[PDB]
Structure formats: C-alpha cells, structure tokens
C-alpha cells in the first residue's frame, strides 16, 4: 500500500496556460486547460482524449513544446498520445508495448529524448526511450533490475544525469542513476534507508540538488537530499512533522522557496513552506481548508503563483491558488474523476 | 546605412547549474576574466575576478550546455571563432580551442531542442554564418555554413516556444530583419524577412510567459521600441510600439518573478533608468524611472535564484558595479572591482 495518490497530472504549457489530465468514470483520459495564461483564468471544461487506461495518466512536455501523455492500457502495455503541434490537436493513441505494473514516470534527457520508467511483472524497473529528440520511433524495452514496491519517480540532476527513486522491498527509499547524460550506463541500486509510506516526490533545488519527500512510518512528511549539487553524500532523513493522510505534492514558488501540500487528518488541505528564501527554514503546517478526497497536485502558473488541485467530496476537481494576502476560496472545475493508479 | 550601434553591454551573464550568477568580460590584457557569486542569493559575496586567459577581439559570450557545463565563445586574434568550456559541470575549464571560420561580429549562441549548441556570427562576406555541435553538448562541431543576408549589427538568436531557433539582426536599410528554422534541430531555414523600423542598437530578444518572441531596440529617435509575435503565430508581428525614453546605450531586458518584463538602459545623464510592466505579464508599461549611478556601458540584467533582478554596468572607474531589487526599492550601487573594456567586434 501507499498514501492516497494525486488524481491529476498537471503542467504549465508552452503558451503559459495550465493543463490538467485525469481519468473519468469511463476510464478515458480527460483534460482541462486555462484559456488565458494567468491565475484565475477561465477553463476549457473537461473533454475526453478517449482511450481506456489502467494507470494514472502522466503528461510530459517534449523539448519542442508538444504535450505527450503516457498511461498503461487494458492490455498492460504502455500507451501514449501526443500533440501534433503546440496549438493543434492530438495523435491517435499508440502502443509502446511492454507489460508494466506501475504508473509511468517520464523525463527528457539532455539530448531531448524522452525516457519512460515503469515497473514490470517481475517487479524490476524497466525503461524505454525515444530514439531521437522529441520523436518516435522508440527503443526496445530493457530492465534496470531491482525489486520495487511503489510507483517510481524520475528527475534529472544538475549535470544532466537522470535519477530514478522508488520504495524497495524493505520499505526504504532506493535509487539508481545514469552515470553520464543521455546514457544507457547506470549505477547500482543503492538504499537511502528510511521507511516510506507514500510514493516519493523528487524536486531539484535552486542550488542544483535533488531533494526527495515522502510520508514516513509515523505519517509525518519526511525529506532527504543531496548535500552537493548533483552529488552525494546525502543528508540523513529529516522530519517536516505533520500528520498526513495522502501523498505529498511539492512545488517551487517563483523565488524558489519550496512548498509542500498534503491532505490532513481532518481531510482538509494543509501546507508548509520555506520562509525567507530557498535556503530558509520550513514553516509550521497550516490549513487551507476544503474537504478533499485525493492528494493535492501543485503547480506554479504563468503569473508565478502556486495553484493547487484536489478531488472534492462530489468527485469533481477543485482548485485554490495564492493571492497577495492569502489563498483564494476553493472553486470547482466540475468533472467526475477516479484514482486509476496502477499501484495503490 | 548605419555603421554604429548604441553602447554595448560590458559583460555576458549566466545562471550556473547551481543557481549562482557568473559574469564574463574582457580585461585590459584582452583576456577573458570571470567572477561569480559565492552563494545563490541576492547580495552574496563574490569570488572576485580570475582569468581564463585567451586574447579576444569580440565580446566573449557564455552559454550553458544542457548538461550544466558553461561554454564561452569569442572571436580570436586570427578572426576564427574560439571557445573554452567546463570539462565537468561547474568545475574545471578546458584550454581555448579554435572552431575556425572567419567572423566579423560577436557570436550568438542557442541550444537546439536536441541539446546541440549552435553559434551564429557575421562572416567575412557580411552574411550570417553558423556552426553547431554534432551531438548534444559535445564536439566535434559541424561544417560552417551560410544563411546569406547582409547584416550590420551583432546577431541575436532565441528559440520559439515550438523549438525553432530564430535569429535577428540589423539590415543594410537599418531595419530589423530575421530568419528562422522551419523545424527544430534542422538546417532548413526560412528566407530573410524584414520587420521594418529603424534600429540604432543591437536587437534584444526575449520569450514572454505566453510563448512569444519580443524584440527590443533603440530607435532612430533614441527611444526604446519593441515589437512582438502575435498570439496566433500566423505570420504577422505586432507593428512597432515605442516605450519612450531617451537612451544612450543598448537596452537590457529581464523577467521578474511573476514574468513581468522590465527594461533597463543608460539615460542622457549617464544614469541607469528602467521601465517595467505593471500588474501582470500582460500589463501596460510604466513610465521611466532613474536608478541613479553613472555608468559607462549598457546595463546587463538577470534574475537571480531568489527571484530578484540584478543589474550590472561598468562604472566611471571601469570596474563592474551592481544594484539589485529589494522589497522596497533598489540597493545602493556597489563595486565588484575589475578593469573591463568593450571588445565588441561591432560598435
Ligand atoms: C478504436 O480504438 C483505438 C484504440 C483505443 C485505445 C484504448 O486505450 C489504450 C490506452 C489501450 O487501453 C487500448 O487497449 C484501448 O483500446 C482508443 O481509445 C480509440 C479511440 O481513440 O482508438
Ligand atoms: C543483492 O542485490 C543487489 C541489490 C538489488 C536491489 C533490490 O531492489 C531494491 C529496490 C530493494 O527492494 C532491495 O530490497 C532489493 O534487493 C538489485 O536488484 C540487485 C541487481 O541489480 O543487486
Ligand atoms: C462554506 O463552505 C465553503 C466550501 C468548502 C469546500 C469543501 O471542499 C471542496 C474541496 C469540496 O470537496 C466541497 O464539496 C466541500 O464542501 C470550504 O471548505 C469552506 C471553507 O471556508 O468554504
Ligand atoms: C455536463 O457534463 C459535462 C461533462 C462532465 C464530464 C464528467 O467528468 C469526466 C472526467 C468523466 O468522468 C465523465 O464520465 C463525467 O460525466 C462534467 O462533469 C460536467 C461538469 O460541469 O460537464
Ligand atoms: C599559448 O597559447 C595558447 C592558446 C591561447 C589562445 C589565445 O586566445 C584565443 C581566443 C585566440 O585569440 C588565439 O589566437 C590566442 O592565442 C591562450 O591564450 C593560451 C593560454 O595561456 O594558450
Ligand atoms: C537579393 O536579396 C535577397 C534578400 C537579401 C537580404 C539582405 O540581408 C538583409 C538582412 C538586409 O540587409 C537586406 O537589405 C539585404 O539585401 C538576401 O541576402 C538575398 C539572398 O538570400 O536575397
Ligand atoms: C513599418 O515601420 C514604420 C517605421 C516606424 C518608425 C521607425 O522605427 C522605430 C523602431 C523607431 O526607430 C522610429 O524612430 C522610426 O521612425 C513607425 O513606428 C511605423 C509607423 O506606423 O512605421
Ligand atoms: C519630465 O521629463 C521626464 C523625463 C523623461 C525621461 C527621459 O529618458 C530617460 C531614460 C533619461 O534619458 C531622462 O534624462 C530623459 O529625460 C520621461 O520620459 C518624461 C515623462 O513625462 O518625464
Ligand atoms: Cl500506506
Ligand atoms: Cl514536463
Ligand atoms: Cl548608433
Ligand atoms: Cl503599455
Ligand atoms: Cl526618476
Ligand atoms: Cl573600453
Ligand atoms: Na510555461
Ligand atoms: Na538489464
Ligand atoms: Na561600427
């Protein structure tokens, strides 16, 4: 098991509008986007990209601006659908084959080739890549071994080497990395210890260090990081306190202060944030109210403000964002969303 | 046909792989020197100046590879394009090496969507020539090739929100001209096209929060002018609009935390002045305001790791001086020392 998942995948697109992808009651992928590149913009409303999915769908932006959505299909293969251009429509759904048993995790190599990581039926971490920048065709599937028990998450280091994180069979946080950018050469699997009870969430700090967040065995939010830009040694685990009842979501304010969000024991949204600067101490947890039924999903918009999405008690997606003085009242974006996470 | 441009910037600035500001300029010895923040925060102490040696006959221009490695390009004493690079991300530097060619402008650099750096410069024949890395963030480099044209300023390159590189330069009729890749990563380019106007500076290009290119340049009336792609990207640009002012240097433009553009230029009194969008990145421009100082170059503007604009400019003592945004105002001008010269291949 893992902490309740994020229900949507969201990005700030090439034209500065937020765009969210979720799964409907019909198992199709639906999406919704801002009309305008600003906090409080009207929304398109929900429209279906069709498909039938059996994981969380995850959107990623190609290095040419085009959105591409990845999800497991009803045959357990990895499937995908992409924009034909940044302000045009979408391709047909296409299979990338394989048999997978987690949500896909996606990142762009420094050379522009997307690389997708997913758990296999043998519980090892598998991967596949675009053979040339922001384009098909793709490589064949290969394994990076291990035995993982959570959805994997990938990020890139400040020197260009991808690094993948996942919970191990001992419930510790484990990781593996490219030994050079764009490479098929990887390190050994190594343990960062800890006991984690959510999927990991990985971010890069302003000063070039990977930092991972997860719920711990005590249901507090815990975090651990590289002590040097793109290098070990790692810190020990440190608690950010709280008692959280979902996965956390983390995003950067426009000044690079990190801010974490999670559902609390009263089912409200709560958050804690760095104060003063991106090197400063973390605040106490404070409530943003609401009554939520998923983990929150956080993103910085084109006005440099954080916006947070979460499924509501009616199964619609609701939204709250930063104001000068505070946060805005919760508003509904409608829809009926389900948690399709391949690992729960 | 103009053979001059507004006074240039004195340094090339970059945000490092670990979020620090690092600047590059030319010493009185004609070597490339550099200076960086100790820490990624507004008001950090600086390392002080250290030499990367070389002997340059252009402005040296830094760019950051997609693997985090800094790379500096400069015209050499033999008029070839030369470069020097970090051998590892944020660590040691290579020796200077020649990429050949015969160039007659400062170089301008961008990364393609596939991670290949591509360098543009005016040639001996006055056309725009170009050369690229053959593989992502690595040598060896391609053959030199021409994009034709006849150009009379330093070129400036930027990338479209769909990954197509686009180069801008002054033409023989003093207008702003441009040329673009027809696909990302490609050697297929459009023809040269005119955006009209009269420009009296190098063009300055940026990408807005909503994914459009916008170009700024001093006009024939010495005001700051700008022009932009439209939201439909359908061929037409906006037509030129004045931001007024009377400026005596090239402009610098950067994005604030919230993506509001902000422009900087020297005034008739040799102070730094600035004008900014208000409310949002779609908002209207303010009137000009002085940031005082007495400066002897164009300003160079950049946003730091705390989300604050920092602005550098050469001072009356030929040292590099610096002022930054505070919550309230802007900080007093402070000196980073050094003795810098303007080595621009076109002035
Ligand atoms: C007419 O069928 C094609 C393939 C469908 C893809 C569906 O969705 C995929 C993700 C997989 O789950 C497939 O098993 C599933 O059929 C897709 O939904 C449909 C409409 O866009 O086109
Ligand atoms: C002794 O074998 C080492 C470490 C293994 C890591 C495995 O996968 C990790 C992610 C954890 O679940 C571990 O508990 C588990 O043994 C790993 O699979 C193996 C081959 O790559 O080498
Ligand atoms: C006075 O009530 C409003 C709406 C509440 C929103 C709640 O939380 C939302 C996220 C949804 O789940 C709604 O169905 C749910 O009622 C919200 O918590 C409250 C906080 O001041 O104001
Ligand atoms: C008037 O109905 C439209 C389409 C609805 C789409 C809903 O939300 C989608 C995500 C799927 O779950 C659909 O099955 C579900 O009906 C959506 O709930 C509603 C919100 O105002 O607008
Ligand atoms: C002893 O010479 C080598 C290459 C030199 C590069 C110099 O600087 C380059 C940028 C070019 O202008 C060359 O023509 C010029 O020689 C460089 O300055 C020197 C470092 O001490 O080593
Ligand atoms: C026969 O001339 C056309 C347009 C030329 C563009 C040139 O280069 C431009 C940048 C401007 O300076 C123009 O005034 C100049 O003629 C261009 O060089 C030539 C070859 O492609 O075709
Ligand atoms: C198609 O462009 C022309 C020239 C423009 C003015 C010129 O171009 C501007 C950029 C400045 O340099 C001005 O001083 C100069 O007069 C002028 O703004 C415009 C009038 O509609 O038409
Ligand atoms: C009442 O005159 C002021 C100064 C003008 C700014 C001009 O442009 C600035 C950038 C500097 O060069 C100034 O010295 C120059 O006067 C400014 O544009 C004008 C707006 O009404 O008010
Ligand atoms: Cl759990
Ligand atoms: Cl992305
Ligand atoms: Cl001039
Ligand atoms: Cl305006
Ligand atoms: Cl004033
Ligand atoms: Cl000088
Ligand atoms: Na964006
Ligand atoms: Na393998
Ligand atoms: Na000249």
Residue numbers in the entry:
A (entry chain B): 26 to 369
B (entry chain A): 23 to 369
From the paper:
As a part of our ongoing programme focused on host-pathogen interactions at the molecular level, we identified a lectin in the P. asymbiotica genome designated PHL, which we prepared in a fully functional recombinant form. The lectin PHL interacts selectively, mainly with l-fucose and oligosaccharides containing terminal l-fucose residue, and prefers an α-glycosidic bond over a β-linkage. The PHL lectin forms a seven-bladed β-propeller assembling into a homo-dimer. Both units contain two types of binding sites situated between the blades and have different amino acid compositions and binding preferences.
As mixing PHL with the branched compounds leads to protein precipitation and thus prevents co-crystallization, the direct study of complexes was not possible. Therefore, we soaked the PHL crystals with monomeric fucoside 2, 3 and 4, respectively. Crystal structures confirmed that all the studied fucosides were able to bind the lectin PHL. In each complex, the electron density was clear enough to determine the position of the fucosyl part of the compounds in 6 out of 7 fucose-binding sites of at least one PHL monomer unit – A or B, while site 2 is occupied by Met60 of the neighbouring monomer, as was observed previously. The second saccharide unit was clearly assigned for all three fucosides 2–4 in sites 1 and 3. For fucoside 3 and 4, the second saccharide was also distinguishable in sites 4-7 of at least one protein monomer. Considering fucosides 2–4, the position of the bridging methylene group is close to the α-Me-Fuc O1 atom, which is not directly coordinated by the protein in the complex. The O4 of the d-arabino-hexopyranosyl unit in fucoside 2 and 4 is coordinated by a glycine backbone nitrogen in sites 1, 3, 5, and 6, while the O6 atom of fucoside 3 is linked to a tryptophan backbone oxygen in sites 4 and 6. When comparing the overall orientation of the second hexopyranosyl unit of fucosides 2–4, it is similar to the galactose unit of blood group H trisaccharide, with minor distortions in individual binding sites influenced e.g. by crystal packing. The second saccharide unit of studied fucosides was only marginally coordinated by PHL binding sites what, together with affinity comparable to monosaccharides, suggests a low importance of this type of compounds for inhibitor design.
